[PDB]
Amino acid sequence: CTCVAIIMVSCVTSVWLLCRTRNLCITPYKLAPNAQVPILLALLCCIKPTRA
Amino acid sequence: DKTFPIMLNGQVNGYACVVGGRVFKPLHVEGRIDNEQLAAIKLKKASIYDLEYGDVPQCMKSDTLQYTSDKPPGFYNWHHGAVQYENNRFTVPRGVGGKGDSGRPILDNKGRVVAIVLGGVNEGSRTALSVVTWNQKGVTVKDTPEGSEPW
Amino acid sequence: DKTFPIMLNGQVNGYACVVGGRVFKPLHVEGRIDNEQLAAIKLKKASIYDLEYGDVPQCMKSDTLQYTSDKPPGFYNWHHGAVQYENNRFTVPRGVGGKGDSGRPILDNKGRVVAIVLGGVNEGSRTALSVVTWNQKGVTVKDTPEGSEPW
């Protein structure tokens, strides 16, 4: 019961910092939809594909 | 142009602007927009990059267009006057620099918005403005000079 | 006259008419009446006749007078033209008959309301109205053509 608490806390903390990294991927680029997008930051580091 | 202000108990303390595809609102003010179509939108908070949500449909969208690349240090228009500066913001005289002027857009000669002010009350003989802009390749950055109070 | 609109998300999608004693608002539309004296009225559901409670205060009772039977085919006015038929309404031409219009009174030459428009967007060469009507001895009916989409 102590071992499943470590595997639950560290799971929801590592994906919490990953969700912050996912969120900060976009707000440089959702603010200017006319700007072009590199192919490295589209699918490798972040999730958003090319749209519009 | 279209730039609706922000109300709080009658007095004017903030301004909200509409760009192509989105709406903006500064975080240094609290209040409700008097427009009913602009009040039911889920405005989500963000960092200093100032991400908001333009959930309004197309039929009133794109009152003005955001500025492209190739920014000179030439003439730029302003609600109280004019500014001629690209790296920093111009040393405008007094009068402008009061309270509640946050969110007023800075436009070019061709009616295209360049920067949105957020601070810089009074910095002596030369007054600077803390604005957001796109630095070199369209990435939206925030510029703040030294000692910039929230204005 | 008096016909206050109903606004959902700022835009206008329908109109609520006030007949003598009772305010009639269609329920196929949704929203809130902008009047503070009418938004406090309770909403009572019905069939597609679309009743609402006549809690109108005594200061401003009897806004409009309804019209009973003995109705000639005649010529009857309309907000975007005229309708000249008794059993149904006139097949009005295209253009008139858009969206966000259902709820208009149809009045006589004396100003007596005889119908309330609900449906009938397109009916071939000319669009045919789907209104509520009072029958040969004063009972409210609903008259629809075949395949009439509502507003």
Curated annotation (Swiss-Prot), chain A:
<comment type="function">
    <text>Plays a role in viral attachment to target host cell, by binding to the cell receptor. Synthesized as a p62 precursor which is processed by furin at the cell membrane just before virion budding, giving rise to E2-E1 heterodimer. The p62-E1 heterodimer is stable, whereas E2-E1 is unstable and dissociate at low pH. p62 is processed at the last step, presumably to avoid E1 fusion activation before its final export to cell surface.</text>
</comment>
<feature type="lipid moiety-binding region" description="S-palmitoyl cysteine; by host">
    <location>
        <position position="46"/>
    </location>
</feature>
<feature type="lipid moiety-binding region" description="S-palmitoyl cysteine; by host">
    <location>
        <position position="45"/>
    </location>
</feature>
<feature type="topological domain" description="Cytoplasmic">
    <location>
        <begin position="18"/>
        <end position="52"/>
    </location>
</feature>
<feature type="transmembrane region" description="Helical">
    <location>
        <begin position="1"/>
        <end position="17"/>
    </location>
</feature>
<feature type="region of interest" description="Transient transmembrane before p62-6K protein processing">
    <location>
        <begin position="25"/>
        <end position="45"/>
    </location>
</feature>
<comment type="subunit">
    <text>Processing of the precursor of protein E3/E2 into E2 and E3 results in a heterodimer of the spike glycoproteins E2 and E1. Spike at virion surface are constituted of three E2-E1 heterodimers. Interacts with 6K protein.</text>
</comment>
<feature type="lipid moiety-binding region" description="S-palmitoyl cysteine; by host">
    <location>
        <position position="25"/>
    </location>
</feature>
<protein>
    <recommendedName>
        <fullName>Spike glycoprotein E2</fullName>
    </recommendedName>
</protein>
